[PDB]
Amino acid sequence: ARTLVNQSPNLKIEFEISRESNSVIRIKSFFTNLSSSPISNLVFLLAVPKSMSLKLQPQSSNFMIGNAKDGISQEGTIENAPANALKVKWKVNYSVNSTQAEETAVFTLPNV
């Protein structure tokens, strides 16, 4: 299932979160364009608690056409994350309509 992380006027961010081990969480982010215009130069930054270890594969692309569903994604894992709340800090910067946009928040993972 998808967990909603954020929805802005231009951009929807979702995580697919699953547990694989007593210590490993799989987290894949999905970016959906809510603008009729393309989003470009998309740069996503994710941080987890100090005690844990984020390991991200490369971001699939940094652009997506107007209304693209799951236009960009990034697969990763969080290590040293025991089954026993997981707080996340994320930031995204991108271009749309020849202006520069930025969204940021702190996100609490569902228990997996």
From Swiss-Prot:
Where in the numbering of this chain does the GAE domain appear? 1-108
Cellular localisation: Golgi apparatus, trans-Golgi network
Q: Which domain of life is it from?
A: Eukaryota
Function of the molecule: May play a role in the regulation of membrane traffic through the trans-Golgi network.
Q: What else is known?
A: Present with 2270 molecules/cell in log phase SD medium.
Q: Quaternary form?
A: Binds to ARF1 and ARF2.
Q: What is this protein called?
A: ADP-ribosylation factor-binding protein GGA2
Encoding gene per record: GGA2
Which residues of the parent protein does this chain contain? Answer: 471 to 585 of 585
